[model samples]
Target: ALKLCPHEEFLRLCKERAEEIYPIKERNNRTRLALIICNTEFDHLPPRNGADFDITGMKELLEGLDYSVDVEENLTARDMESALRAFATRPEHKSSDSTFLVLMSHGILEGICGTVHDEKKPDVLLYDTIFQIFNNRNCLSLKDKPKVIIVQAARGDAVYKTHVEKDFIAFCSSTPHNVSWRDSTMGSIFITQLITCFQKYSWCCHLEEVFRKVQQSFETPRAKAQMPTIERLSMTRYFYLFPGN
Candidate 1:
């Protein structure tokens, strides 16, 4: 039901916030691109037990939104860097309206740990690297694009100027210095709830509403004290997946 909201409904919404929402390159039915990099194994830390479900659910969610998902799994720090570098270099962004980048793995307090992370030689990808990589000075095609990041393992630690950085948003699984939980059979609470929220609301609500909905779900009576957080919110306007469009 990702595209549950009809074009008329979305059009009505656009009219309500016509000049405030991000531009949708829907005239020619352009392709939407998304990147999913999830690490399930590790040489040092224990493997993410339920990441199997997380990866599958995330991929399906993006696909349902009409994004051509490019998935990378079980990558080391070096591999992850190169993967993201190549993704940033893709010519596809020139024709796409937006891009969704999902980075999932085990994490330290400050950054997401790569597969080869260990005490002797830690391999981590700082949140800064991501921002810098897709910044205007680096990635021109995606410069003004409404970019979204889904960080499941862990963390940002944003504002923007026109000639600098702009139109970006991100969600992190847990608050700083806290540990996140995962179910062996189900999945991490954040990813599962994220999938649920997007599945239920992406049809109508804007992306911000959808992200906030995930946060609201974690604030339930029983789910208290396990809140997820908005990491980097640099978006300048409302973004609708506009699925069926």
Candidate 2:
């Protein structure tokens, strides 16, 4: 006396899988947050043309997902460090499932430029140091939570290459030793693809799946020279943008 039709079987399997992926747990009542630092102006360096285009789009995207968005622009190295450090220790991280940190600027071999107030007085914020601000020891609030770090910058090689954390995932604009392309009118290829994928897939697919789609989008002839790099994705459970929907 057993009835298992194809549709019913599929729904049963989905339910089982969801139970395994998202077991009963303490409710995450904290508000999700997205910190966006887009540096479009540099005192001594050339302006990051079209970077502002990403600001409005990214803010809207994150807000649509019930995340409170904070946008900061044109920060110096000291300011950048302080802002990130403060965000890392926020009380909201204690109960939030995930967090997002977005950085956009001009980069060199060592790190990204926060802002060179003067050629005589320069301030370079090492990407490595930025990552360390949220390390397990430094930022315990998000120790076991997934933190998505997205960087849209030139000279992708400037980013810290070795990532040795379990709950951190970084999305770099380009592969190491390569430069990312940007359109003065449209914005960087990586950022454009990122927004497009998240907008279309975040509601129904896993996070990494959306990233995979973004990678494929950049494989076209026009974007052949550029590639997005995903690093240190060692999550124990499947993370969906919208769970149980």
Candidate 3:
């Protein structure tokens, strides 16, 4: 059931939008690359709860979409930095159509925890701190290549947040001071919905519709859910990898 908002036209327009969104033939002549990084640690830096399954699933998803994805698991902040640096330094990586980086792990309000030492805490790194380290060169491949970051971490005033460029399209799993949901029944709430949407729609739908499916699917019984938000630069204008055809 498609619930219409104040404007029913929005739903009506989705069909037309879908036509334009799928079966994109113009490759943009740019290589699509992605990096999926996961941290398998908690505050004390022990082998904490991990999102490895989600990481692996996402790797397969991107590859299925014809993207060249590089996936890394159990990376600390320093390791993340090194991997990003290496990605940016790649000669072929310098020029690409789109780039994506996905991170999943336990997180605080403003930052995602990394398996590193914080003098005071001993096993956490501010998400922004690790990310911003590369904000300057900004992943050479996607420097201006319309990048997307999908982060599943706790974010709130209680912790440091990762500040990114508007050009960096991203989704923060939870709002400030909110904890991301994990399900003992299946897995994390977000991953469940995300994978559901992918399975249902595949590449036949636009991201907007895919996002809508995710937003809707999580609304069922016994679910800890957070509405995903896409943040972008006000001045930057770009379309999805596959726009309305």
Candidate 4:
């Protein structure tokens, strides 16, 4: 395994790498997009990691920004594919613009799950499995453009997953192949922290900075107890490019 750097160092490198790959593109208008949120409610989880809480939080964020929102609650793997493809390949909806997908629920390093597809279920969507669907040529739109996917899941026992990708941002609650913790608190640890600190930085703040804070917060014994991670695509250039103000 590669030696990990301090959070500050990692963050610096993340921005530098993003610049190398996508560079900042100056555009007067922010990109209009659709935000697809997938949440599942199972056996009344606590700390509000359940689907209900996720949907509520997501709705607040997206509506606050005025982005068009499409949500699916308590979805199975098959339903997940259907929902995702609809957004990705919607001919009239996406012509030459970007889009975002947010997944918040119980997850393994493999993939997020519906209420039914857990360890015991015969079928589930692995990490690569669901992503590949969007990655498919038929499903792709704005190919070279940015396609942001925010995942609040677990990778495993590590403190964070990785922040080195140029055009993708992924934030997991725990490290790889491990189950992230849930609490009786009002919100998930990562989302709570995100809502609190997200806007402190200028609009120029890139997604790398977002994950940098997430990883550092998880460094605490209590925070690290859950293990939060963030991964982002370096390709994105603007901050308020999504719909609404």
Candidate 5:
């Protein structure tokens, strides 16, 4: 063997040891995960007849894009917080390259509706609290990872938190103080259009582009037209739903 310099010998030994003991991380390990929360009924509000449809469609769509999905239904504000906290701690986050959290419910500028009990009207969980759990400081396993939060609710506000400055993406159903349209039999228009947009363009388009297509689909022909909002996104590279076969 030829004589090697001291620096070269150290680097060569490290590489040899790694090859012997460690399984190298693969760039093709593109694991995607999703969490879905759909509050279909509430004690103080009318039953959401089409939320189940939204759940099924969303689950199917995400799975088609190779996401392993977890779902929670009819969660109260406290329980919803707990669920999200536990979800953030999952070991899967350490390996997943991207994640999605979808929340569908009755909402206002304050927040989304949760389960109400007895005669007491349940309070809402503020949007600030919802996103805070996933901040880079809190959800360390998901630091620098892309997190997509999709909310389909009536009169929801756009979130402008500091944590979402780098890798967070928010897709809300409507602008601030505006009601989103829904069909009792067919599901909310925003989610329906979202599914449609992804199915048509997922293989060929980036996420923000896909969202814009959904937004454009709702821009027509009604006096009080519902609009989809892409609230926050600061990605440096293009993120494709399906990059290749």
Candidate 6:
């Protein structure tokens, strides 16, 4: 389930009423950019065992769907903020129609943990900072464009537009106060299944549908432990990945 074939219905509907859904904006390299921050090695924490696999799957999946990955690895909280800020202001935004921001790391209820995270002297990248950075007023080039944000890694826990901030849909790996599972061999279960869901459904289904599909995939064993959830979804319209022309 690593490759994708265009979905006949999806392709047809998109052409029929392209206005109803977000544009692919990918006809040119202009729309081809993405951000993926993966922290495997940490200053105060143990390395993320299979986190590397998460990077490959995420980069490959987004690239397959037509994004040029801009990946930054093992950064501190402040560093992550800088990278996010830089990406939000990139010149490519005006020419792009959509984007994906993937953040992978170890996390706690406070927020995503930085490479330097430790209780003795804590440093956390607040999720609020990310939203504000990409808020409509700030990131004008991406205004009204669907911003697909996917967060990997587990969190012990878990929004609107315009000043309301519309056109955003995000999915986080686990629920609040819970632990998510990962393997030394395969990646995190939620992430791996999420990639699988996208690989199999993004071509044919809308973003929510794909999320539901990933949820359905956890109907059994992993069910009792992990239940991935959406953290932000102010997007006013349906978003289809629209694999190809």
- Models 1 onward score TM values of 0.89, 0.79, 0.66, 0.67, 0.78, 0.88
lDDT of 4 at 126: 63
lDDT of 2 by residue, 2-40 (tens): 111244433554577874342212234657888999888
Predictions in order: lDDT: 0.81, 0.72, 0.56, 0.52, 0.71, 0.79
lDDT of 4 by residue, 1-245 (tens): 11223445434544766644333222234334555555545543322244465556756665444345677666766777777777766663344344557777656656776556545553345666545555525464545455667676543286233322234445556443222454433555566665444444313344566557656766876556666654434454543221112
Worst-scoring 10-residue span by lDDT in model 1: 154-163
Best by lDDT: 1
Write the residue-wise lDDT of candidate 6 on 133-217 in tens digits: 8988889989889888888767542132345577888788745323235367777777788888888888778889999999898
Model 5, span 1-245: residue lDDT tens = 11112444334433665433212123367556799988877877766777788998999888876678999999888888899899899987787777899998877665677776223665576677766888777888777767889998775266644645467788987443332354556777778889888877765566788898898887788713678777756565555554232
lDDT of 5: 0.71
lDDT string for model 3 (1-245, tens) is 11112223334444456544222223455456778877765445444343666776778766655568887776776677677667666665454555667777666655666666454854445555545644535554444444566777644364333333435556557643232344322445576567667656643454556667777765666443466665433214433333211
**Best TM-score among the predictions, by candidate number:** 1
Where's the lowest-lDDT run of ten residues in candidate 4?
236-245
Better of 2 and 4 by TM-score: 2
Candidate 5's error at 209, in angstroms? 0.2
Query: Which sections of candidate 5 miss by over 4 Å?
Result: 1-30, 117-122, 156-165, 175-182, 243-245
Alpha carbon lDDT of residue 227, candidate 6? 77
Q: Which segments of model 3 are wrong by more than 4 Å? A: 1-30, 42-50, 117-119, 122-143, 154-164, 175-185, 202-204, 232-238, 242-245
- State the weakest 10-residue window (summed lDDT) of model 3: 1-10
